[PDB]
Design an enzyme around this catalytic site. Structure first.
Site, PDB file in Angstrom:
ATOM      1  N   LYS A 104       0.831  -1.195   0.000  1.00  0.00           N
ATOM      2  CA  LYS A 104       0.000   0.000   0.000  1.00  0.00           C
ATOM      3  C   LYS A 104       0.870   1.251   0.000  1.00  0.00           C
ATOM      4  O   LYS A 104       1.604   1.515   0.955  1.00  0.00           O
ATOM      5  CB  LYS A 104      -0.942  -0.005   1.204  1.00  0.00           C
ATOM      6  N   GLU A 162      -0.860  -8.272   4.103  1.00  0.00           N
ATOM      7  CA  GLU A 162      -1.120  -9.645   3.697  1.00  0.00           C
ATOM      8  C   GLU A 162      -1.871  -9.675   2.364  1.00  0.00           C
ATOM      9  O   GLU A 162      -2.777  -8.874   2.134  1.00  0.00           O
ATOM     10  CB  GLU A 162      -1.922 -10.375   4.777  1.00  0.00           C
ATOM     11  N   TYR A 163      -1.486 -10.596   1.488  1.00  0.00           N
ATOM     12  CA  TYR A 163      -2.111 -10.712   0.175  1.00  0.00           C
ATOM     13  C   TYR A 163      -3.414 -11.507   0.239  1.00  0.00           C
ATOM     14  O   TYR A 163      -3.455 -12.607   0.790  1.00  0.00           O
ATOM     15  CB  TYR A 163      -1.143 -11.365  -0.814  1.00  0.00           C
ATOM     16  N   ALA A 164      -4.475 -10.938  -0.323  1.00  0.00           N
ATOM     17  CA  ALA A 164      -5.764 -11.618  -0.389  1.00  0.00           C
ATOM     18  C   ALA A 164      -6.079 -11.992  -1.835  1.00  0.00           C
ATOM     19  O   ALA A 164      -6.495 -11.144  -2.622  1.00  0.00           O
ATOM     20  CB  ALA A 164      -6.858 -10.744   0.196  1.00  0.00           C
ATOM     21  N   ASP A 224     -15.203   1.851   9.207  1.00  0.00           N
ATOM     22  CA  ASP A 224     -15.287   1.912   7.748  1.00  0.00           C
ATOM     23  C   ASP A 224     -15.638   0.562   7.116  1.00  0.00           C
ATOM     24  O   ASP A 224     -15.085   0.178   6.085  1.00  0.00           O
ATOM     25  CB  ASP A 224     -13.977   2.442   7.158  1.00  0.00           C
ATOM     26  N   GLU A 264     -15.853  -2.897  -0.189  1.00  0.00           N
ATOM     27  CA  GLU A 264     -14.534  -2.587  -0.729  1.00  0.00           C
ATOM     28  C   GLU A 264     -13.427  -2.892   0.284  1.00  0.00           C
ATOM     29  O   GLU A 264     -12.290  -3.178  -0.093  1.00  0.00           O
ATOM     30  CB  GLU A 264     -14.455  -1.120  -1.158  1.00  0.00           C
ATOM     31  N   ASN A 265     -13.765  -2.836   1.568  1.00  0.00           N
ATOM     32  CA  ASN A 265     -12.771  -3.047   2.621  1.00  0.00           C
ATOM     33  C   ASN A 265     -12.819  -4.449   3.212  1.00  0.00           C
ATOM     34  O   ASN A 265     -12.258  -4.703   4.278  1.00  0.00           O
ATOM     35  CB  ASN A 265     -12.948  -2.023   3.738  1.00  0.00           C
TER      36      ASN A 265
HETATM   37  N1  LIG Z   1      -4.126  -7.282   0.788  1.00  0.00           N
HETATM   38  C1  LIG Z   1      -4.816  -7.068  -0.360  1.00  0.00           C
HETATM   39  N2  LIG Z   1      -5.004  -8.055  -1.264  1.00  0.00           N
HETATM   40  C2  LIG Z   1      -5.689  -7.841  -2.404  1.00  0.00           C
HETATM   41  N3  LIG Z   1      -6.236  -6.658  -2.741  1.00  0.00           N
HETATM   42  C3  LIG Z   1      -6.127  -5.583  -1.927  1.00  0.00           C
HETATM   43  C4  LIG Z   1      -5.389  -5.737  -0.663  1.00  0.00           C
HETATM   44  N4  LIG Z   1      -5.423  -4.544  -0.046  1.00  0.00           N
HETATM   45  C5  LIG Z   1      -6.117  -3.698  -0.847  1.00  0.00           C
HETATM   46  N5  LIG Z   1      -6.540  -4.313  -1.971  1.00  0.00           N
HETATM   47  C6  LIG Z   1      -7.327  -3.673  -3.057  1.00  0.00           C
HETATM   48  O1  LIG Z   1      -6.869  -2.330  -3.214  1.00  0.00           O
HETATM   49  C7  LIG Z   1      -7.814  -1.396  -2.691  1.00  0.00           C
HETATM   50  C8  LIG Z   1      -7.083  -0.554  -1.665  1.00  0.00           C
HETATM   51  O2  LIG Z   1      -8.021   0.145  -0.864  1.00  0.00           O
HETATM   52  P1  LIG Z   1      -7.624   0.584   0.629  1.00  0.00           P
HETATM   53  O3  LIG Z   1      -6.419  -0.215   1.065  1.00  0.00           O
HETATM   54  O4  LIG Z   1      -8.899   0.522   1.434  1.00  0.00           O
HETATM   55  O5  LIG Z   1      -7.201   2.112   0.339  1.00  0.00           O
HETATM   56  P2  LIG Z   1      -7.588   3.329   1.318  1.00  0.00           P
HETATM   57  O6  LIG Z   1      -7.077   2.904   2.672  1.00  0.00           O
HETATM   58  O7  LIG Z   1      -6.849   4.509   0.736  1.00  0.00           O
HETATM   59  O8  LIG Z   1      -9.093   3.403   1.206  1.00  0.00           O
HETATM   60  C9  LIG Z   1      -8.935  -2.199  -2.052  1.00  0.00           C
HETATM   61  O9  LIG Z   1     -10.219  -1.644  -2.359  1.00  0.00           O
HETATM   62  C10 LIG Z   1      -8.782  -3.584  -2.640  1.00  0.00           C
HETATM   63  O10 LIG Z   1      -9.595  -3.684  -3.812  1.00  0.00           O
HETATM   64 MG   LIG Z   2      -8.017   4.151   4.353  1.00  0.00          MG
HETATM   65 MG   LIG Z   3     -10.521   1.684   1.420  1.00  0.00          MG
END
Ligand SMILES: Nc1ncnc2c1ncn2[C@@H]1O[C@H](COP(=O)(O)OP(=O)(O)O)[C@@H](O)[C@H]1O
Ligand SMILES: [Mg+2]
Ligand SMILES: [Mg+2]
Ligand SMILES: [Cl-]
Lengths: 33, 267
Positions: free
Chosen positions: B37, B86-88, B131, B135-136
């Site tokens: 990130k 961690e990778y999802a 939150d 999406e989260n």
């Molecule tokens: N560990 C992960 N594995 C797979 N996809 C991810 C992972 N983390 C984030 N993503 C994707 O990237 C986006 C990142 O959003 P997020 O981390 O919530 O950004 P912010 O914190 O700025 O809102 C998520 O909506 C998701 O689709």
């Molecule tokens: Mg955020």
């Molecule tokens: Mg987000």
């Protein structure tokens, strides 16, 4: 200071490898009253 | 000894964020797949949410739960901030919902159970996510649900909060009405989420946010006819205007509709 967080920042060897680390929250609650 | 950007090969973008993108990552030595990130310091300091990033990094890194995404570490370079997550593998529930239009009662109850378990663990540590939204919510290699993005979270063993935190369609009435809030905001959003899993759309969705604010404050919504009585009951309890009248997560996990459709047990 900015961007200096109380969090892991050291290199981890993902080839090598508890539930207590949760105690950080209790600790923080007491410390900060 | 410290993390460096040179330690990672950067792959495809996994998703876009408010202050930067999340990339697929590979630790060059162990070939371990991660998510990186990336947050630009300029955007963070301009919006004045650096303190919130501290909260995201510190809180998430110290949490340990099968249904909570792991944050292994972090580092920065005077231009960007890098979070090692961690990778999802199976992506967001949001993408899954978009793919499937709507979840059946078995899938919905399963997701709620996993989420309520993870939240119950969070609230035991006096942590509020603030939150919760599709999406989260991420999916593991076996399809297990994992909470992610603690970018609005706060450790509150003492104070009740005043911060307008979260996302429009999921905002609790107390925040909209300029009141103080506590951990009960996670159970409101849980109710909003359960509705969207079954219907395919947020219950207070509107063209303008002013109208959305109105509908949220009134708790003004209806169910489509196919929503079962058990589902209607659970959602209605979670979407109480009075925060203290909303049930406990232990009560949600023991809900008859939940325990009759879930494929996974409680904590
Ligand atoms: N560990 C992960 N594995 C797979 N996809 C991810 C992972 N983390 C984030 N993503 C994707 O990237 C986006 C990142 O959003 P997020 O981390 O919530 O950004 P912010 O914190 O700025 O809102 C998520 O909506 C998701 O689709
Ligand atoms: Mg955020
Ligand atoms: Mg987000
Ligand atoms: Cl209003």
């Amino acid at each position: 200071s900015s961007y200096s967080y109380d969090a892991p920042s050291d290199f981890i060897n993902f080839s090598s490898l508890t539930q207590n680390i949760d105690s950080w929250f209790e600790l923080k609650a007491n410390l900060e009253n | 000894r410290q993390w460096a950007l040179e330690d990672f090969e950067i792959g495809r973008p996994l998703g876009k964020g408010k202050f930067g993108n999340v990339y697929l990552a590979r630790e060059k030595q162990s070939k371990f797949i991660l998510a990186l990130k990336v947050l630009f310091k300029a955007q963070l300091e301009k919006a004045g949410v650096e303190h919130q990033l501290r909260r995201e990094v510190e809180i998430q890194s110290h949490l340990r739960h099968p249904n909570i995404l792991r944050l292994y570490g972090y580092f920065h370079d005077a231009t960007r901030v890098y979070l090692i997550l961690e990778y999802a593998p199976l992506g967001t529930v949001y993408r899954e919902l978009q793919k499937l239009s709507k979840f059946d009662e078995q899938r919905t109850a399963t997701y709620i159970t996993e989420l309520a378990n993870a939240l119950s663990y969070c609230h035991s540590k006096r942590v509020i996510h603030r939150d919760i939204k599709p999406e989260n919510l991420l999916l593991g290699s076996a399809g297990e649900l994992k909470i992610a993005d603690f970018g609005w979270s706060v450790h509150a063993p003492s104070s009740r909060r005043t911060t307008l935190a979260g996302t429009l369609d999921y905002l609790p009435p107390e925040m909209i009405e300029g009141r103080m809030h506590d951990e009960k905001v996670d159970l409101w959003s849980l109710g909003v989420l359960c509705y969207e899993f079954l219907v395919g759309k947020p219950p207070f969705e509107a063209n303008t946010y002013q109208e959305t604010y109105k509908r949220i404050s009134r708790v003004e919504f209806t169910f489509p006819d196919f929503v079962t009585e058990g589902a209607r009951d659970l959602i209605s309890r979670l979407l109480k205007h009075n925060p203290s009248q909303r049930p406990m997560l232990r009560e949600v996990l023991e809900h008859p509709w939940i325990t009759a459709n879930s494929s996974k047990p409680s904590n």
